[PDB]
Amino acid sequence: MGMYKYIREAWKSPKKSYVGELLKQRMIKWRREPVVVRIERPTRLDRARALGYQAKQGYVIVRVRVRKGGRKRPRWKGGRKPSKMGQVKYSPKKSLQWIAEEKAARKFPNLEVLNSYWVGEDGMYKWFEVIMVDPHHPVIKSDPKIAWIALKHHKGRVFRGLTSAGKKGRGLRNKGKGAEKVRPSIRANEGKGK
Amino acid sequence: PYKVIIRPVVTEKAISLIEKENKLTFIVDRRATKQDIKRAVEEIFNVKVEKVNTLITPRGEKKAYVKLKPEYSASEVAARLGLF
Amino acid sequence: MAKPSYVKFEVPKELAEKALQAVEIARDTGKIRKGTNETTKAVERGQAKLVIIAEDVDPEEIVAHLPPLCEEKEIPYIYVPSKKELGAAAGIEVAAASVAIIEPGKARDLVEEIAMKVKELMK
Amino acid sequence: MKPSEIREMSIEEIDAKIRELRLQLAKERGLLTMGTSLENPMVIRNLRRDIARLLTIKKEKLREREKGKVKK
Amino acid sequence: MGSGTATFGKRNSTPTHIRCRRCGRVSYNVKKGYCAACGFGRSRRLRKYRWSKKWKKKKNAH
RNA sequence: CGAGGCGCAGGCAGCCGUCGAACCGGGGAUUCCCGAAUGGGACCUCCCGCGGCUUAUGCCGCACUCCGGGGUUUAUCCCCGGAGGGGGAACGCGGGGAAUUGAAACAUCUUAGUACCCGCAGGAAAAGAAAGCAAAAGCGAUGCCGUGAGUAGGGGCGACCGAAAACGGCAGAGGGCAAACUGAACCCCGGGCCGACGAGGUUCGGGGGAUGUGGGGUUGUAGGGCCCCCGUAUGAGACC
RNA sequence: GGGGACCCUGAGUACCGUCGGUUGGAUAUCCGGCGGGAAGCUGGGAGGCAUCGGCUCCCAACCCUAAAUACGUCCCGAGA
């Protein structure tokens, strides 16, 4: 029941449920907007809270705009064997959702990626909103539901991958079959896992 | 608040600065400035400095040529320090 | 006026002051729910006589559902241009995108009027 | 030279005794450069240590005094 | 260029390489503003590499 | 520790040390300039805009870029608070990614996710309490070692390539959200009282906060709400 | 503890289709990209092709995790 579930479910189909007029209306504004914009307040609150969101001092949400499509491989300095030659079907190991977390983290380096989600997409771009919190302010430290990120250890989590997009990208999603070569790390097996 | 004066040099050149020119030679701080050398002298020997010329030597030290006003002679100062 | 998407109609300024004035009497006398979700329950529960809705709310999503949800529920709803005023009317320090008067008191004649005025403004 | 004799002095007396010590050091080094007739390595070595001592003892005292007031 | 090496060589005269503000080796190329050894001017970081160079001196130091 | 010392370094000379050295430990003072080098540039130097203070010289504090909060002609122009960058012996985690070679040629394959390259963290990382496993029987986190096994399996089905589950071991540890239901009950900062100036509790001025702080709760659901009946905050830890 | 709707229970996710990368992973690896796209526990996934039935197990799309396991900067001890 209740308000949150209705919004979340209405966003699930972004084509129905009055989301479509909004998506179109905001997207002109967003294509205009710079590739990185800081926002004081959330968008899909309903989605953000489930990831972890609080509205205390030092919590930011930021829209990162990232390009559509995979990679496009560098040109050669030598010669190549026929399989390795290819450049136009290349696609990254990191997810586009992941790439946004890292973009956000470079821009503000004293603030750390809790999580992130998708705000929708056009033919040329995708937008992801990344949830950061500062892991230096006493404000976060006192509260024990978000105190984990504050620890010294926890910085630089986004690159190593420990976030939802980071974990999903790493292929740690099961502990069974298909998880016979990614255990416990990709490079515990030297790069085998994906 | 810092060491000003490293030491007197006394040489055959020193006697020429002292006698003709009325000037005294010192080895002083290697980060010096004129403004400082003049006032520091002024207080310490209890003298009037007309002028200061400086050169930083290829010996890693700085040599200061302090001209006194011809009332406070080089010779009276010179006698006290670097001679008995 | 401003704010689009779910705002079908413009509420005149004189209507809005009467609505905001009923909301203050409503907290003292009767009951009021403050905040988007409570208003959401209040409509689902059937508890709410009148829901009030702030125009400036950004993103729209928080808000978007309430006029068609309200239509099914038979609850009338009226639009306020500024949020800060609404939180303020509600009796609170911060703003509110949405509030619901759950059963008025001494406001009852005024709220019934606001409710008819809006339907007369637009069904 | 002992650290104790240095502590018995006042802060004002420490400044005047530094100027005098350094000027003595300046004067000996001029004698050495002229060519030694004193033959004590002592004077330059001891003065250098003595100069350090008056300054350290001095900085520490002002620091103590300043802290004392703040508490009381 | 090829032979006649004596006839050629009047430059080097001009200098393009020094004792570095950062490292102290002989490679702060005045023209680029880059130290070949340390990487000062070019980078915030010191130049260090798997091959290495920089490392080798450091191990050697140990 | 304590009776000679004054580094490697046996000289000459002189010195210091019972108000106890040299030496060893712990703590403290000073710790140039350049350097992430942060006010700006440089060939390791130089210049400069404020503000404090001494009569002056002298001297002390400051202005790159995030976040958090102010100030105001709100010039986004300036102020107070907290941070970032760079390094590091290997290891670790995440990205980019060859070829010589092998297949006696060589293109798929092989080298190999190797070499090399980027980002980044710690003292261990990561993984981690099953949308598991699948001898269908039996198990209830995860690393790691032995083994499975050079097995299944892949592959010009050529050369080569190549696991896991399980077992025996080792070491052992389980917990938090979102939501339902509540809705400002809350957090941060400063000051005081009460208290061994501590833990804790109380109150007073700001800031954050309904785009939701905080309470509840989390594999599995306990009716989650509202009920009842009996022990019924009776009772007793457990933690600081 | 049992009494009614049991709490609704995570989305571009699960899954499908198209191209790679990779892997031992075979139709039966994993990860990306491009297009499409669920369910309200009256539900979903899993047991090495697809689909339908029985049977057994288990809850992805939110988060953290000591210890046991790496190293040789440093100290000590050791040497067919």
PDB file of C-alpha atoms (C1' of nucleotides) in Angstrom, chain E residues 18-22 24 28 30 40 44-46 48-50 54-55 58, chain F residues 34-37 42-44 85-90 116-120:
ATOM      1  CA  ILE E  18      69.109  20.239 -15.864  1.00  0.00           C
ATOM      2  CA  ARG E  19      69.176  19.464 -12.059  1.00  0.00           C
ATOM      3  CA  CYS E  20      65.622  19.295 -11.349  1.00  0.00           C
ATOM      4  CA  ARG E  21      63.691  21.141  -8.788  1.00  0.00           C
ATOM      5  CA  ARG E  22      61.874  17.980  -7.848  1.00  0.00           C
ATOM      6  CA  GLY E  24      67.657  16.487  -8.574  1.00  0.00           C
ATOM      7  CA  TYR E  28      64.576  19.153 -16.355  1.00  0.00           C
ATOM      8  CA  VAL E  30      64.177  23.948 -19.770  1.00  0.00           C
ATOM      9  CA  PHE E  40      58.021  17.083 -12.972  1.00  0.00           C
ATOM     10  CA  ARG E  44      51.941  15.647 -10.343  1.00  0.00           C
ATOM     11  CA  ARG E  45      53.323  12.179 -10.050  1.00  0.00           C
ATOM     12  CA  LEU E  46      56.893  10.908 -10.258  1.00  0.00           C
ATOM     13  CA  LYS E  48      57.788   5.176 -12.399  1.00  0.00           C
ATOM     14  CA  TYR E  49      57.272   2.192 -14.556  1.00  0.00           C
ATOM     15  CA  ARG E  50      57.313  -1.603 -14.498  1.00  0.00           C
ATOM     16  CA  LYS E  54      63.088   5.237 -11.008  1.00  0.00           C
ATOM     17  CA  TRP E  55      62.372   2.005  -9.089  1.00  0.00           C
ATOM     18  CA  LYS E  58      65.384   3.088  -5.295  1.00  0.00           C
TER      19      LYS E  58
ATOM     20  C1'   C F  34      62.168  23.234  -4.182  1.00  0.00           C
ATOM     21  C1'   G F  35      58.219  19.398  -4.008  1.00  0.00           C
ATOM     22  C1'   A F  36      50.982  17.152  -4.245  1.00  0.00           C
ATOM     23  C1'   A F  37      53.313  22.705  -3.784  1.00  0.00           C
ATOM     24  C1'   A F  42      60.326  30.158 -13.107  1.00  0.00           C
ATOM     25  C1'   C F  43      66.198  27.107 -15.979  1.00  0.00           C
ATOM     26  C1'   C F  44      65.420  24.527  -7.187  1.00  0.00           C
ATOM     27  C1'   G F  85      44.555  15.793  -4.443  1.00  0.00           C
ATOM     28  C1'   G F  86      50.362  13.222  -4.104  1.00  0.00           C
ATOM     29  C1'   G F  87      53.520   9.049  -2.164  1.00  0.00           C
ATOM     30  C1'   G F  88      54.120   3.880  -0.601  1.00  0.00           C
ATOM     31  C1'   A F  89      58.566  -2.609  -0.542  1.00  0.00           C
ATOM     32  C1'   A F  90      55.224  -6.053  -2.636  1.00  0.00           C
ATOM     33  C1'   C F 116      52.650  -3.463 -20.782  1.00  0.00           C
ATOM     34  C1'   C F 117      49.054   0.682 -19.632  1.00  0.00           C
ATOM     35  C1'   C F 118      44.906   3.496 -16.435  1.00  0.00           C
ATOM     36  C1'   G F 119      41.734   4.244 -11.610  1.00  0.00           C
ATOM     37  C1'   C F 120      41.987   3.078  -6.531  1.00  0.00           C
TER      38        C F 120
END
